Amino acid sequence: GLSDGEWQQVLNVWGKVEADIAGHGQEVLIRLFTGHPETLEKFDEFKHLKTEAEMKASEDLKEHGTVVLTALGGILKKKGHHEAELKPLAQSHATEHKIPIKYLEFISDAIIHVLHSKHPGDFGADAQGAMTKALELFRNDIAAKYKELGFQG
Template sequence: MLNAQERAQVAQVWDLIAGHEAPFGAELLLRLFTVYPSTKTYFKHLGVFPDEVHLLSHGKRLLEAVGVAVLHMDNLRWALSPLADLHAHVLRVDPSNFPLLIQCFQVVLASHLQGEYTVEMQAAWDKFLTGVAVVLTEKYR
């Protein structure tokens, strides 16, 4: 999936955001809900105006899952299988939401990392996150 240079770029970006999963994840979710309001249907428990505590909590879980994927780039299917089962069989999340999430995540990364987030890093992260989305949607078949 990723060549050695792309893997290094994904790891380099993750090193910049590791430890800040909650605020990055909360901003990602807030951006997702704002730009694509239909995605909020899966988060009715957050209310009309999600409070910061809930956004930080779920955002942290979301980015912790990304961290697991970063650590297991060689075996995403194994690493993300429980998460894929949850989203496909229990939560029944529309898989068309994953590309929207990826898009919002890229914007959050670019806005925070600015000059440190090169075009090459963006391309590597796009490829990586697309691979994550593919694994998460495989259980829908």
């Protein structure tokens, strides 16, 4: 779990994201897709957007980034009391979208990368520690649900 102080750091950093969720979400997805092109193949409507420039030129992709980060923001604001929120995501991602847990590792690292890229010198060491713990908790709780289902990939 995270301490009270750590959750406060997470939700404070998240305000920077909320200033422009779509711009942040776009950059997170682009980082994910360009760094790990296998991830892009899971998106029937985006898998033809194989380069950063092509990805940047799609409002549909930017809207999906908005969906993703809005979901994550709601989850983070539960401060770990997120069973009900994570349940359907774990299920849809294992059973419907076929997303290996490794891809959630990749997107977690992408979020850290994008926070430093968009806010260089403004994502402090304490904030990175806390956000990393929150993303670990998110992925780990999803991983428990994946194990229940026997889903690998």
